[PDB]
Write a structure and sequence with these properties.
The structure is cut from a larger assembly and holds 2 copies of chain A, 3 copies of chain B, 2 copies of chain C, 1 copy of chain F and 1 copy of chain G.
Chain B lengths: L1 H5 L39 H4 L9 H4 L15 H13 L18
Chain C lengths: L3 H5 L22 E4 L9 E4 L16 H4 L9 E3 L4 H6 L25 H9 L28 H4 L15 E4 L4 E4 L27 H8 L7 H4 L1 H7 L8
Chain F lengths: L7 H4 L4 H6 L4 H6 L47 H4 L8
Classes of the chains: A alpha+beta, B mainly alpha, C alpha+beta, F mainly alpha, G mainly alpha.
The complex binds adenosine-3',5'-cyclic-monophosphate (CMP) (2 copies).
Protein name (chain C): DNA-directed RNA polymerase subunit beta'
Family (chain C): Belongs to the RNA polymerase beta' chain family.
Organism (chain C): Escherichia coli (strain K12)
């Protein structure tokens, strides 16, 4: 696919955990490509609280907006969630790879279509669904993750209420107060961090 | 005659909004699940602990959970996360139902 | 399945047999029906296999004239081509839709049998025994009896062939920019022919022998397709009126 | 008849003989 | 029901393919082994019998005494004049019988728009030619009338002798009261990708223009439903 | 009957010819993979099953014919040379 | 009755029919001439080699329709390559030759 | 079109109980034509469309 | 230049107001391009509340996501706001123009970058900034749009009280309350849809 003729002239660097691959404000003069691992894209405000938009695993590009129009700036931050290997190719040398293989451009420009949708749909989630609704969907999303812990009753997940507020967009207190609110209605269960839901499977 | 009446209630203009038949049939299965645990490339340690816990196929392990397997004083957490790592490529994971299992055995 | 070996233990000899792609596996793979003995070549023809619930081989009724066999308890073996080359030849000359005429003489070997001809001879029936010719505008009008130029053939004139039957009624029909006096049965099959290739059939009781000279001329100018289509409506309206 | 055919690899064998 | 006595699926209308103003499509997927011929025969005797509608019944042409007679000023004989009166689109609001007049003298095939406009009767097909002139002297003038009835009755069956309510002038013509022209039903056991005993009910209908194909199906069906009150209830 | 079958025997003044036209080439398409087929995917059969289309068949490639080309021994000499084809498992 | 795969002899090398397995319909000569009349080709040589006599061409074909490929051309019949030796013991020498 | 009670509505006038096994009920308001289309759309609705116990 | 080479194979077809250029559910077999006027794109929920993702003015493309990957459907609804002239070019004949001239594709995918930057940096403001702060930024954002008309006092735009809440993420009732509140303090103006802000420029 895309791997075919592309990783022959790169620059292996690798970025440690909790690193900074993209700095919002700098000039885009280097294209990135994910080989192995994953990465999370988020942004910050004037305080310090973060807000994750969407997760991007392997086979995805990082910072490709500054390729068409020369003279742009980084849109959002790109913090490496885990140990991942990313290549480095300047936009100047990238344009030369298109003249010899337009197919490579057909791949990168293809992913920009899906990303434009998932980002727009993310905005609607912060206008229609509330705290209870947004977090409810997160419980099922984390259960589908490889790091999830299956349970005879339902699904067991291990995640702090501080990270949840960075996904749905709220405080850490609200997440907890509502978490135990569903316990009285006999829907789910919680014992600190262990959240065992019901109805799954 | 009542049966015939219900066979025409759609013309008398009645508030009955129900879908006819929305069935999708395309018989398929996963014979790869019938493959032994010797297709995930494991170590001698796990290759002796699992088989000792009535585990000969990959389907006999998925049916269980990684919360009760920790109770047995012959396993651990690293012996479960390693399995799920390989199951990622096969398309399997702990906490999934099975079909046509067990496979061909000694039907009485 | 994902392995030929794994699938071998599936459809062995147990209660695990389940239908699946058996429908798609057999679509464009013709088969040679061999009913010995075999004198000419019509003994071995090709037809597109179709799955049907049962433990018997259903054969076409119109092709029974070639295999000259009855359904009293006979038996026939069937062969299946493997190589693609033979699969192509099975639809080139082995097929039956291309071998309609007779190699010996030249007359159509495949003709209506017992039922397919009964339905046609019934719909195409008059009464003959007329007197002569007259004005006749009111009085007679007896069913759909044969006559020169009278009865309801002049009283009931309709442009379109659609509105004519219903309550059983005949009159004047328009065919080949000309005026004729026939019934709905005399123009029920003689109107589907011009649909593909226009011709001219002499006014006579349509029978097993009459169609023989028809299929012949319906193959002289055109290929093989425009002629085999006519052999479709003949079967449908062959078992319909043969039940009433 | 074996003189004429319909191959030539659909345009990848005319330069093979 | 609530007592669980049915245990069977009941068909229902979902979509109406309106390809025209008279001809449409009425599908019915949910069917079983037996109901395919039941509904196909329980309505077949209605759409071809118990149908209101309206069409041409009597036409009194000036100068015309009978059918076999002739007429000076027309190309075709009187026999063909009544021929093109079977397929005449007419839609009257609320009236059992309406009389229309036609006064036109000159050269040019008289259409349906030449008839005196009435705020009651609606003409669906105004470009419908019924006669053809030849010269200056050529001039037609008849009082066509359209009324209701019940089913279809040819002019050969509704005829007696040369005497009637108004012998001189009138011209007996086929009256197609029933909006529907013809109805055909084919079982054809369909072979879907899955279930075997699956059949659909293809109801082919081609009305004239008196009513809508959408309300025509429910109307004819409701009438049948008005014959089962002493079964489902009555207590 | 069948699709575009009587049209191939009427377009050209022979029947025995059409045979090899879709024979020694058709069987060669399978033993050579599928890449040799350069024409578009338009000229291809249609198989109704599971709401999709498979197989391929032929009889829709006969369009640009010619008289003299290659002998008859090279048809399967350089064909199985450029492409070996086989069957492997994981 | 229907047969697809079964056992085979040694010197004869032909399809048989045991108990658990069915029997194959012997393609009589009466059906050979009826095929030659059409003027076929490949569908005639198959009902003589792989589908009966030819052995090394029967196994290779079985490994061609399993992966969705196509079977190549058959080889030399077994009832023919042994005849060369059968006639060799009759004081007469036989030798094959190409072009 | 109209549609305003043009036909008669079937009503139970009298039932006949000749036996505890067989009965002969009958309706009165039936137009000429509905006495066959309603009988044919019922003859095949009680030959297999009936539960029962055994 | 390349743009003129694109209009040489177009099909001029004017679309009246309140029309339907893109129907969610049909097959994408026609590429659209805006010449004059403006168009809006939005989605709907289960009730009836709308949600505008991004606006598209003149010089922009309509429905270009179903070009990279053949075999897709219309994502959102596209209703013609005003009388606009849009061209028509099938995707089939378009792919043949890319293989011979990749430069034509460099133009379309060039506008897909800006539409992603104004959406990713908007989510952050819809989780920390309050109603007053979110709406304030929206006023300046709409003023930078080419469809904005110059005003002697500031800028004159035309937007409903719903579309505003669809950008700042809130209810329609809250928008109307604050909007009228700023009128008493002599800061802005509103007479139905036309909102004339002050302090701009
Ligand atoms: N929501 C998102 N989804 C995917 N990628 C994003 C998202 N937000 C920002 N990015 C990437 O972060 C990059 C920052 O620099 P660029 O503008 O070059 O390109 C940007 C995008 O590729
Ligand atoms: N947030 C957005 N920004 C720009 N364009 C959009 C946005 N959302 C939808 N669209 C366009 O609306 C179109 C709907 O149909 P398409 O899927 O063909 O292509 C879609 C996009 O081109």
């Amino acid at each position: 696919p895309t791997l075919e003729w592309f990783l022959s002239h790169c620059h292996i660097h690798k970025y440690p955990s909790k690193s900074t691959l993209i700095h919002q404000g700098e000039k885009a003069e280097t294209l990135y490509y994910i080989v192995k691992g994953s990465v999370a894209v988020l942004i910050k405000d004037e305080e310090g609280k973060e807000m994750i938009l969407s997760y991007l695993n392997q086979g995805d590009f990082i910072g490709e907006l500054g390729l068409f129009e020369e003279g742009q700036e980084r849109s959002a931050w790109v913090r490496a969630k885990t140990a991942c290997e990313v290549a480095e190719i300047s936009y100047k040398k990238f344009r030369q790879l298109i003249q010899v293989n337009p197919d490579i451009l057909m791949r990168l420009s293809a992913q920009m279509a899906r990303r434009l949708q998932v980002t727009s749909e993310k905005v609607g989630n912060l206008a229609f669904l509330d705290v209870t609704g947004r977090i409810a969907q997160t419980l099922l999303n984390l259960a589908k993750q490889p790091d999830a812990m299956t349970h005879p009753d339902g699904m067991q997940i291990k995640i702090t209420r501080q990270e949840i507020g960075q996904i749905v967009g709220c405080s850490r207190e609200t997440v907890g107060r509502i978490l135990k609110m569903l316990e009285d209605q006999n829907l789910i269960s919680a014992h600190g961090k262990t959240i065992v839901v019901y109805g799954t499977r | 005659a009542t049966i015939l009446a219900e066979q025409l209630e759609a013309f008398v203009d009645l508030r009955d909004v129900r879908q006819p038949e929305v069935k999708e049939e395309k018989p398929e299965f996963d014979p790869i699940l019938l493959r032994p645990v010797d297709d995930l490339e494991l170590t001698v340690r796990s290759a002796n602990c699992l088989k000792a816990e009535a585990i000969h196929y990959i389907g006999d392990l998925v049916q269980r959970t990684e919360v009760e397997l920790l109770k047995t004083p012959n396993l651990g957490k690293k012996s479960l996360t390693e399995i799920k790592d390989v199951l990622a490529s096969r398309g399997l994971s702990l906490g999934m139902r099975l079909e046509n299992w067990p496979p061909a055995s000694i039907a009485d | 399945a994902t392995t030929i070996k794994a699938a071998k233990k599936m459809v062995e000899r147990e209660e695990a047999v389940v239908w699946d792609i058996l429908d798609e596996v057999i679509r464009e793979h013709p088969v040679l029906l061999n009913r010995a003995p075999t004198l000419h070549r019509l003994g071995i023809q090709a037809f597109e296999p179709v799955l049907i619930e049962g433990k018997a081989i259903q054969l076409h009724p119109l092709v029974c004239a070639a295999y000259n066999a009855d359904f009293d308890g006979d038996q026939m073996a069937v062969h299946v081509p493997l190589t693609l080359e033979a699969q192509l030849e099975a639809r080139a000359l082995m097929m039956s839709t291309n071998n309609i005429l007779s190699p010996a003489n030249g007359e159509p070997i495949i003709v209506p049998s017992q039922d397919v001809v009964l339905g046609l001879y019934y719909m195409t029936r008059d009464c003959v025994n007329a007197k002569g010719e007259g004005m006749v505008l009111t009085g007679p009008k007896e069913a759909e009896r044969l006559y020169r130029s009278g009865l309801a053939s002049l009283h009931a004139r309709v442009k379109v062939r659609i509105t004519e039957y219903e309550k059983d009624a005949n009159g004047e029909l328009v065919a080949k920019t000309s005026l004729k006096d026939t019934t709905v049965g005399r123009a029920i099959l003689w109107m589907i022919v011009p649909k593909g290739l226009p011709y001219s059939i002499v006014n006579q009781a349509l029978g097993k022998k009459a169609i023989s000279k028809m299929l012949n001329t319906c193959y002289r100018i055109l290929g093989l397709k425009p002629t085999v289509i006519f052999a479709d409506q003949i079967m449908y309206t062959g078992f319909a009126y043969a039940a009433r | 008849h074996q003189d004429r055919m319909r191959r030539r690899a659909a345009g990848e064998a005319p330069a093979a003989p | 029901m609530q007592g669980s006595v049915t245990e069977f699926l009941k068909p229902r209308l979902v979509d109406i393919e309106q390809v025209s103003s008279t001809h449409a499509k009425v599908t019915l997927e949910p069917l079983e082994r037996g109901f395919g011929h039941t509904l196909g025969n329980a309505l077949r005797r209605i759409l071809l019998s118990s149908m209101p509608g309206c069409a041409v019944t009597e036409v009194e042409i000036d100068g015309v005494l009978h059918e076999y007679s002739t007429k000076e000023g027309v190309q075709e004989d009187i026999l063909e004049i009544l021929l093109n009166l079977k397929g005449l689109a007419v839609r009257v609001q609320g009236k059992d019988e309406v009389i229309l007049t036609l006064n036109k003298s000159g050269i040019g095939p008289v259409t349906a728009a030449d008839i005196t406009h009435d705020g009651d009767v609606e003409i669906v097909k105004p470009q419908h030619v019924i006669c053809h002139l030849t010269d200056e002297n050529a001039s037609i003038s008849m009082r066509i009338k359209v009324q209701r009835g019940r089913g279809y009755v040819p002019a050969s069956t509704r005829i007696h002798s040369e005497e009637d309510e108004r012998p001189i002038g009138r011209l007996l013509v086929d009256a197609c009261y029933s909006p529907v022209e013809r109805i055909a039903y084919n079982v054809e056991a369909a072979r879907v990708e899955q279930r075997t005993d699956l059949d659909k009910l293809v109801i082919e209908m081609e009305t004239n223009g008196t009513i809508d194909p959408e309300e025509a199906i429910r109307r004819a069906a409701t009438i049948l439903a008005e014959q089962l009150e002493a079964f489902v209830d009555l207590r | 009957a069948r699709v575009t079958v009587q049209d191939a025997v009427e377009k050209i003044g022979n029947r025995f010819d059409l045979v090899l036209v879709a024979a020694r080439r058709a069987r060669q398409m399978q033993v050579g993979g599928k890449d040799p087929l350069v024409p578009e995917e338009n000229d291809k059969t249609t198989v109704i099953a599971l709401r999709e289309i498979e197989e391929g068949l032929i009889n829709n490639q006969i369009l640009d014919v010619r008289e003299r080309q290659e002998q008859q021994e090279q048809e399967a000499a350089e064909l199985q040379a450029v492409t070996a084809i086989a069957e492997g498992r994981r | 009755h229907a047969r697809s795969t079964g056992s085979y002899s040694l010197v004869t090398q032909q399809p048989l029919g045991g108990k658990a397995q069915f029997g194959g319909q012997r393609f009589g000569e009466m059906e050979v001439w009826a095929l030659e009349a059409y003027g076929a080709a490949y569908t005639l040589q198959e009902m003589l080699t792989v589908k009966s006599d030819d052995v090394n061409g029967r196994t290779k074909m079985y490994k061609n329709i399993v992966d969705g490929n196509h079977q190549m051309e058959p080889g030399m019949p077994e009832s023919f390559n042994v005849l060369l030796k059968e006639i060799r013991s009759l004081g007469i020498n036989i030798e094959l030759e190409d072009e």
